[PDB]
Amino acid sequence: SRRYDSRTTIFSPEGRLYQVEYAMEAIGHAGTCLGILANDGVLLAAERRNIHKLLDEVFFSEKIYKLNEDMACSVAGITSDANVLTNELRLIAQRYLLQYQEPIPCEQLVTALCDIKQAYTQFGGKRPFGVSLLYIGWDKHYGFQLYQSDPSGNYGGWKATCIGNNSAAAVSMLKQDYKEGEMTLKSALALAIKVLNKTMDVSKLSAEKVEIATLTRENGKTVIRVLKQKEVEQLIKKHEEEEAKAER
Amino acid sequence: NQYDNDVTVWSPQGRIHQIEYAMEAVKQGSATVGLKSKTHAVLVALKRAQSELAAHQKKILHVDNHIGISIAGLTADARLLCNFMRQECLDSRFVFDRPLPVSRLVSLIGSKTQIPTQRYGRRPYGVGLLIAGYDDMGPHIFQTCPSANYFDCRAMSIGARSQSARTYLERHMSEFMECNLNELVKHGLRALRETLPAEQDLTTKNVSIGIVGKDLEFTIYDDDDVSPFLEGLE
Amino acid sequence: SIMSYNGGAVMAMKGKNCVAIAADRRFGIQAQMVTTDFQKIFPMGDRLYIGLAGLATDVQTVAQRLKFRLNLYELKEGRQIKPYTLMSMVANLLYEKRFGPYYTEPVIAGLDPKTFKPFICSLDLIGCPMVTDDFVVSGTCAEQMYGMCESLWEPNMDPDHLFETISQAMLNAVDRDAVSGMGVIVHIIEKDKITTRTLKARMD
Amino acid sequence: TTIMAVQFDGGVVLGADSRTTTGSYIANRVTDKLTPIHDRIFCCRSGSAADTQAVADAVTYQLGFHSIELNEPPLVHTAASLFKEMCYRYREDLMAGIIIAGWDPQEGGQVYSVPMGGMMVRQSFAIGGSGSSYIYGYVDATYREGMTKEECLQFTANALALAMERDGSSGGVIRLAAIAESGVERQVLLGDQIPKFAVATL
Amino acid sequence: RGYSFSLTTFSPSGKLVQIEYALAAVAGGAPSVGIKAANGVVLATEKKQKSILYDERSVHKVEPITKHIGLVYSGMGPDYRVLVHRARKLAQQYYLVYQEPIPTAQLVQRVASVMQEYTQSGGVRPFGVSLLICGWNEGRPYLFQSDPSGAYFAWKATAMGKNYVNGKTFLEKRYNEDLELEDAIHTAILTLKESFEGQMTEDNIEVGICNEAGFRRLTPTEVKDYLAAI
Amino acid sequence: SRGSSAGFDRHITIFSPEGRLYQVEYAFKAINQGGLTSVAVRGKDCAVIVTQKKVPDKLLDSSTVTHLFKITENIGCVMTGMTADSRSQVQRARYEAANWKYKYGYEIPVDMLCKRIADISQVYTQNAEMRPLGCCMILIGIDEEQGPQVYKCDPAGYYCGFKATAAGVKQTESTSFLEKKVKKKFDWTFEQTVETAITCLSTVLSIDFKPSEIEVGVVTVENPKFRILTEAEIDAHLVALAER
Amino acid sequence: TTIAGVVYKDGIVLGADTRATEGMVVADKNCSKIHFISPNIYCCGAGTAADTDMTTQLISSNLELHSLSTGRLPRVVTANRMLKQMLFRYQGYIGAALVLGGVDVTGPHLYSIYPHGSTDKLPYVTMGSGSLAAMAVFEDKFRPDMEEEEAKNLVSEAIAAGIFNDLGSGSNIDLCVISKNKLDFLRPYTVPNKKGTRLGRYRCEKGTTAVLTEKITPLE
Amino acid sequence: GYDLSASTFSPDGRVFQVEYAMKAVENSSTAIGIRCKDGVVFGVEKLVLSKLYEEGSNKRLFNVDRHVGMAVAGLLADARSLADIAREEASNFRSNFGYNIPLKHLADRVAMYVHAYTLYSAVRPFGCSFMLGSYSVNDGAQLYMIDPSGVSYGYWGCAIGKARQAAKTEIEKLQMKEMTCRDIVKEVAKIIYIVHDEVKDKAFELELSWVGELTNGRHEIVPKDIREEAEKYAKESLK
Ligand SMILES: *[B]([O])([O])[C]([C][C]([C])[C])[N]C(=O)[C][N]C(=O)C1=[C]C(Cl)=[C][C]=C1Cl
Ligand SMILES: *[B]([O])([O])[C]([C][C]([C])[C])[N]C(=O)[C][N]C(=O)C1=[C]C(Cl)=[C][C]=C1Cl
Ligand SMILES: [Cl-]
Ligand SMILES: [Cl-]
Ligand SMILES: [Cl-]
Ligand SMILES: [Cl-]
Ligand SMILES: [Cl-]
Ligand SMILES: [Cl-]
Ligand SMILES: [Cl-]
Ligand SMILES: [Cl-]
Ligand SMILES: [Cl-]
Ligand SMILES: [Cl-]
Ligand SMILES: [Cl-]
Ligand SMILES: [Cl-]
Ligand SMILES: [Cl-]
Ligand SMILES: [Cl-]
Ligand SMILES: [Cl-]
Ligand SMILES: [Cl-]
Ligand SMILES: [Cl-]
Ligand SMILES: [Cl-]
Ligand SMILES: [Cl-]
Ligand SMILES: [K+]
Ligand SMILES: [K+]
Ligand SMILES: [Mg+2]
Ligand SMILES: [Mg+2]
Ligand SMILES: [Mg+2]
């Protein structure tokens, strides 16, 4: 029925896809989520929105998802949509392992999901998924990698990036502080906290309010770990001591 | 207005504007005439020519040995319906080894053409047909419409300025039953001629004739083959 | 017989706080040995292994498709799969093919990922599970294996004694079977380590 | 199996033996082969136990629904036609030899045979199953037009007893039912209540 | 055939308004409460029950999913009945495959996923319900909420429906980690009294509990007893 | 809020800004278009349905004008609201019951039948392409353990069992009448069940009936088969009431 | 297999042996053949083991969905209909031969169910390759309205008759007793067979087995 | 607006698309049925829109089974499609159950098919009302009428189309319970002549059919000579 169809998969007069753009507005309001590539690893750091006192803390993270043995992601946008996409990511990665008996290379996983997102903009008459994703991974072709995808089904690779609230401000801080070829997991961790400290300007930054995951290689094996709160408090402490030095 | 775009939307006066609009396609077609006697059924059609160098559109179509049609409205819809009629006739010969009775064929058309008038996104057929046939019940002239209704006729005309042709046919219809073939065709031609601007005449380029009856399979006459019928409109 | 086309034998066996699983190493086609290092035992966890005997192509397919399911299960759930739950997962996979089955009859051996209690079982080709407290056997020399296991196995054996018993059960059983052998591999599973050995074995 | 039904003025009598066999093992020695399909309509079942139970359950369903929709008792002819439709349609996958009998207010007592293959014919009396072979002659000689209900019961019990004596696949108890406007009356003949005919000693 | 286009879409400010409006149906529902004690979970709800004419026992808001899992809701009752049925079926499908009762979180994830579908799939509106789901597995109690978007959250205690914002602040100033189940049942009922209007009987509230023995509804006579102190 | 509207929320079953479903609300109004009221009451021994029987036209065969339907031999029903919608819901209940019996081997309990019908109605409130049915079903039957039962379900897909209930134009007034009467009764339970139903109906309409102006159907613990009273049977009740 | 059931005064007694065979080899000595259907209904299984397992699990599950919905304890007739309609649909290719017994609102009921989908409702039934041995015990000794202990004695004797006279049956006797008031799942009920004890010792000391290769992998 | 789709209720609980379809019926010329002691008689005022049409063109009286007649008013192509539905339901009933479909059941089945077209945006309601009549020794005479909403009731007398009320008021004057079909045909013809507006619509054919003891329970056209006598009685009665 033509009267009720809101026509989610058509062009506007300037060649735009409004549902896609409107979905990108939803993402820009979600929790800030950054990714940083180093020489010995990659990390994801995300603002937690689940912070009410009475929440129970039952899973290992809020927005960090393991995808397969060598990859993880984080998300900004509609949570339920993110649950659908991450489930589909895990399936794709296992279909590839089944078929080739080696892990899916990172960019091929990202591309495979992005083709699904693209299809939702072109046919079917459905709303797109209100999700942007950061992917971290290791594979044997390109080593440590960091990708970003959005509701248009576009993606790109990054050395550092940010999605969600105050992204623009976070990317400027990264542009300035990030050292191409010269970062370590320890200095990327420091930069991540520095960035979140300026972009959560509502308000004073706390371990309860962030989640950090790191991805490294130890003895021919990928290790993916969500940092315990003790470790996050220590990084925040160190960042605050560092600002004590800042003048003299 | 809000009631005129969808064949599924009844208006508040209990009409369906899409069906009425589809009937306009038939009123703007070129005229055709159908009439019958005790022994023959005749179709006469005016063929409209797009330019002086164009042939003149086919208006009369063969359905089966005992059935032909004349068309007014969307040609592509005419062909779709004609193909359905052909297939129903072939089926009845295949299964029963005898010609499909003309009135049963026309019931089939009614039932087929009704369906899209009741389903969203579908449209009526934009074509009206005059149907000439002969069977155990004698000769027949039937008329079909985009509304899916159909009519059993002594004679009929549809298309542009067809009202003149109907008036002529009412005026002389008490004569039709007892006419020989020649008389009957002439009556068809004179009715058709009433539809024309005063200047213009029936010619071998613009007239087409179809005849079926007791001794005669459905046959179409065009071009030089209509000259005998046009001579001695005297 | 379809199950003797490739030949092969697996067994598992329970001790005190430990389990053992063993397999011959022959990949052959009827009479012809093709290779002598063919894998029939596959890790489904740090302390949980599945051994498959039967048609070599289905050994491989069932191991792979099982792994696909298990990986999805572990990512979705918080956690490492329990031994009993793996059995069920495998039962379900096999019975889905009830009317055109995979020709493989697996054994599972493991320790519970939280309690470390010993677990062993076997299943038939359509997924009927059998849990035991001693041993299980599958392959073309099942009768030979039963004879050795029934005579040698004892309750509450330590890792060293379990190793000796499973080894002797396997070696002597396969030595009466034309299409099993060409080497035996044995895994002992303990809380704190896995020990993997190939045995000195007849190669005819 | 041996099954039988007989029309009388105002109703029907139905009977069956009670033996279910797999090979020559008796899996049930007291089977109830007379199954109610509606308040005054029964079927007697022979052939495959599984097939006849499944078909009877399905027809009970169809007839019950039909009867609620019409708000009237079903015709015996309608029950029979439903059996026939299913037994004819699936004749290649079913082994079912059925007798449908009952009472309705329009046509009274009626007996229909639906033998294997799915034809349907009304009869004054019907016999079926493996044991029926042994009683064609008996029933052809003994049947009389205008029998009472009680005579029909006796005639049916005698016929079934004779069949049961000779057919390895029939035996056990005789189950009888009488159906009329006033309702259904069921009984069992067992042991010494089964009519007896001496074996012929020299 | 069915409308194949989404009835929930993005507004220019990035909102899925149909989900927002579903949340407004929830907020206008009858109040519901969940409190995770140290040794169990309690779910309690008010019956929006006019009339003495109602047979209070004929339909239940607090429902078993499995031996070990139960549900209550706030918002549209008939929508809830759809989700109870699907949750039960999801729980059985799990059991047939794994031969272990479904962990509470896995059940929530699967139900939440059904709710997400109804925000995107063609020709349908979202569910106008939020669920509170309790269970016991791996030696421990769980309380979850699942909202019309398909988002789900693990709570120590919460309230939903009419006056939920105040209910939550009442629980904040009253829940503690070491609290027992018998105490928790009380505080759940007190939380309902905060927004009641009507005088509470055992016939116009429903209470369910989850512990190591399993999930069950408290009987009228058991509720009556907890109400004597309140 | 307070009667707000956006987009197509008055045309299809999508949420309004307050979270309402206008199209479902309008289906309740459609129940009243027929101008009729029904009442049902359950006691310890029976359950009863009473409804108005309006035959305005003399040319109608009044034996075909009814709102009482047999669903199974043991379940009866009264329908209120749009007539063809009601017939359709009656057929579907007949189908559900018969199918339950075939699959499960015992008669469908009245509560499960009412629930199933309600769950079917729910789909119409969540799927945009069809309207809700503008009718309300009241079912009566005997449960072996709980005694006589009265269940009602509505176009929102809500359902409930009752001591007594009503439907149609004077539903509220009937509800108040019945509430006032049970409060007075011991163990809050109706005892004179046919009388209460007819009296309730007669009060809220202000009519005082002839036996041809109402229909009455019953199920009892001693006689669980659903029964429609004849005129003469109904008249005996009207006369017993008239004299006290 | 030998499986059997009896209706007694106050309920049902079900019985079974515990042998499973693969060919003419014992594969399981302690197979559990008495399956949960619902808290008041159990089902013995004979025939193809995967099929008895899967069929009873599926029906138990669909019945749990049914009772959750009705709020009532299920009926034996219901389990019977569901099992038979499924087995009929599969035309005998699901090789489940079942003894279904329970106690419901209408009292105790016992059915035998065959792979092609026929069922018989009877006060005593037997299935499996030992079914004739067990049936002979029943024909010889069954009485109506037995007491609980008499009925348990009789079902164990009938299972024993299969265990000892049928090569397809062996090992232990399991019972299940179901009344209005009680469910006793007696596994094992009796252990009439036992492995003899080992006269020699084959405790092979470390190094007896020659080893080609070893790898220790430490875990957490 | 609230009146575009049969899947949309108006705010007062009406389905305007069904009501508009009913208006199509109410614009059509009048058809009547009368049940009497020994059957059912149908009459239709069949307006002749052109003298070029054959006598009998556009019948509004159909045989839907050998024992069942149908009389229609409204959009004729919709009515014919309904006649075909009724025919198929009767046929399929005989094939499945093995006897002639009872009238009431046929009426209820086709009513439910009509009703199915009043729920959805995907289809439009039928623009027709129709009567079904039969007779058998077992069931007596039965006359049902079905409207575009799918409501179905039984009647002693019934009229549909634009002079419906004028027709009904004349039908009420007859003691039809005590009359035979032969007497009733004359009265049907009479009533059609009464309600026909000869000023506004110039020409009509009377169409008559019946089913009753006199046709042995077969629905049949009234024979030509009986119809002519009935017309003549009606015309002189108009005097
Ligand atoms: B009778 O035709 O001999 C009798 C009638 C049935 C309807 C009771 N038939 C049989 O006994 C034929 N037997 C079976 O169908 C059967 C029974 C059992 Cl227990 C198992 C397998 C089979 Cl195929
Ligand atoms: B009994 O019917 O003899 C018994 C019942 C089961 C439930 C234990 N049946 C058997 O022992 C027959 N064997 C199996 O179904 C079987 C077959 C296969 Cl292919 C593999 C293993 C087993 Cl255990
Ligand atoms: Cl992986
Ligand atoms: Cl991988
Ligand atoms: Cl044209
Ligand atoms: Cl054209
Ligand atoms: Cl027209
Ligand atoms: Cl025209
Ligand atoms: Cl797979
Ligand atoms: Cl049987
Ligand atoms: Cl036969
Ligand atoms: Cl036969
Ligand atoms: Cl016998
Ligand atoms: Cl669409
Ligand atoms: Cl449910
Ligand atoms: Cl469970
Ligand atoms: Cl409970
Ligand atoms: Cl049934
Ligand atoms: Cl009272
Ligand atoms: Cl049954
Ligand atoms: Cl009208
Ligand atoms: K015999
Ligand atoms: K809707
Ligand atoms: Mg060897
Ligand atoms: Mg060799
Ligand atoms: Mg078969």
User: For residues A209 and D150, what is the distance between their CA atoms, to the nearest angstrom?
Assistant: 93
What amino acid occupies position C36? T
- Assess contact for H31 and H60: CB atoms under 8 A: yes
Q: Identify which of D30, D50, D93 has the shortest CB distance to residue G118.
A: D50
Among residues B12, B17, B1, the alpha carbon closest in space to that of B123 is found at: B17
Q: Give me the domain span that covers residue D55.
A: 1-202
Residue ranges of E strands in chain H:
31-36, 39-47, 61-65, 68-74, 128-136, 140-146, 152-154, 157-160, 204-212, 220-221
What are the chain F neighbours of A1 within 8 Å (beta carbons)? 129
HSE (side-chain half, CA atoms, 13 Å) at A229: 9
Q: Which residues contact B43 (CB under 8 A, 6 or more apart)?
A: B32, B33, B34, B60, B68, B69, B70, B130, B132, B188, B209, B210, B211
Method of elucidation: X-ray
- Every domain of chain E and the residues it spans: 1-230
Containing structural domain, residue B158: 1-234
Q: Which CATH class is domain H1-239?
A: alpha beta
Distance, in Å, from the CA atom of G203 to the CA atom of C162, rounded to the nearest integer, reads: 10
Residues B199 and B188: their CA atoms lie apart, in Å, by: 20
The binding-site residues of ligand 1, defined as CB within 6 angstroms of any ligand atom, are D 1, 20-22, 27, 31, 33, 45-49, 52, 129-130, 169; G 114, 116, 118
Separation between Cα atoms, residue C80 and residue C85, nearest integer Å: 10
Q: Does domain F1-244 have CATH number 3.90.1150.10?
A: no
Output the residue whose Cα is nearest ligand 1's atom 22.
D22
Residue partners of A27: CB distance under 8 A and separation at least 6: A76, A77, A130, A131, A132, A150, A151, A163, A164, E14
Between chains, do D78 and H138 touch, taking CB under 8 Å as contact? no
CA of G84 to the centre of ligand 20 (A): 8
E175 contacts: CB under 8 Å, gap ≥ 6: A54, E35, E156, E157, E187
CA angle (B90 as vertex; B86, B95 as ends), nearest 5: 150
Determine the residue of D42, D48, D83 to mutate for testing ligand 1's pocket, defined as the one with the most ligand atoms within 8 A of the Cβ atom.
D48
Q: What is the DSSP annotation of C177-204?
A: -TTS-S-EEEEEE-SSEEEEEEEP----
Query: Which chains have at least 3 CB atom pairs separated by less than 8 Å from chain B?
Result: H
Q: Which residues pair with H140 in a beta bridge?
A: H136
Reading phi first (left if > 0) and then psi (alpha if -120 to 50, else beta), residue C151 is in alpha
Beta strands in chain B (DSSP E): 32-36, 40-46, 60-64, 67-73, 127-135, 138-144, 150-153, 155-158, 207-213, 216-222
Contact in structure between F123 and E124 (CB atoms under 8 Å): no
Question: Two tokens at E214?
Answer: 């399993």
What's the gap between Cα B220 and its chain centre? 13
Distance (Å) of CA G32 to CA F52, G46, G176: 62, 11, 11
Measured CA distances, E15 to A21, A30, A77, G182, H27 (Å)? 12, 12, 11, 58, 50
DSSP letter at E194 equals T
User: What is residue B127's DSSP assignment?
Assistant: E
Q: Which one of H15, H114, H151 has the shortest CB-CB distance to F83?
A: H151
- Distance in Å, alpha carbon of D113 to nearest chain H alpha carbon: 15
Do E92 and G61 make contact, defined as CB atoms within 8 angstroms? yes
Identify which of F71, F91, F98 has the shortest CB distance to residue D61. Answer: F98
Beta bridge partners of G34: G44
User: G82 and F103 in contact by Cβ < 8 A?
Assistant: yes
In angstroms, what is the C-alpha Rg of chain G?
Answer: 21
Rg (CA), chain H: 18
Task: Give Cα D168 distance to the centre of its chain.
Answer: 19
Q: Active-site residue numbers of D?
A: 1
Adjacent-strand bridge partners of A167: none
Q: What are the tokens at E150?
A: 């398909």
Contacts of F12 in chain A (CB under 8 A): 4
Query: Is residue H139 within 8 angstroms of chain B, CB to CB?
Result: no
**Which residues lie below 8 Å from residue E81, measured CB to CB, with a gap of 6+?**
F115, F118, F119, F122, F157
8 A C-beta contact, residue H71 and residue H42 = yes
Q: How far apart are CA E187 and CA E33, in angstroms?
A: 10
Q: Does E122 touch chain A (CB under 8 A)?
A: yes
List the one residue out of E150, E115, E156, E147 whose CA is nearest residue E33. E156
- For the record, the structure tokens of H101 come out as 């479909």
Q: Is 3.60.20.10 the CATH classification of the domain at E1-230?
A: yes
Q: What is the DSSP string of A161-214?
A: EEESTTHHHHHHHHHHH--TTT--HHHHHHHHHHHHHHH--SS---GGGEEEEE
Helix (H, G, I), strand (E, B) or coil at E184: helix
Per CATH, the number for G1-220 is 3.60.20.10
CB spacing of D66 vs H98 below 8 angstroms: no
C172–chain E Cβ distance below 8 A for any pair: no
Rounded Cα gap, residues B32 and B78, in angstroms: 14
Using a CB–CB cutoff of 8 Å, tell me whether G106 touches chain C. no
The owner of tokens 């039952």 is A58
Annotated active-site residue G1? The verdict is yes
**Residues sharing a CB contact under 8 Å with residue A190, sequence separation 6 or more, in sequence order:** A235, A238, A239, A242
How far is it, in rounded angstroms, from Cα G179 to Cα F62? 54
G35: Cβ below 6 Å to ligand 2? Answer: no
Which is nearest to F107 in space by CA: F145, F68, F75, F146?
Answer: F75
Whole-angstrom CA distances from H111 to A220, H68, H115, H116, H119 are 74, 15, 6, 9, 14
Q: What is the resolution of this structure in A?
A: 2.0
Which chain C residues are closer than 8 Å to G208 by Cβ? 164, 168
Q: Provide the domain count of chain B.
A: 1
* Residue (of H44, H48, H50, H47) closest to H62 by Cα position: H44
Among D68, D101, D98, which residue's Cα sits nearest to residue D85? D98
Q: Which two tokens stand for residue E140?
A: 């421990």
Tracing tokens 């010995």 back to the chain, one arrives at A40
C85 contacts E98? CB cut-off 8 A? yes
Ligand 25 centre and the CA of C33: distance in Å?
8
**Nearest residue in chain E measured CA to CA from G53:** E96
Q: Quote the CA–CA distance of H108 and D71 in Å, as a whole number.
A: 13
H143: helix, coil or strand?
Answer: strand
3-state secondary structure of B138: strand
**What CATH number is attached to the domain comprising C144?**
3.60.20.10
Q: Structural domains in chain A?
A: 1-248 (3.60.20.10)
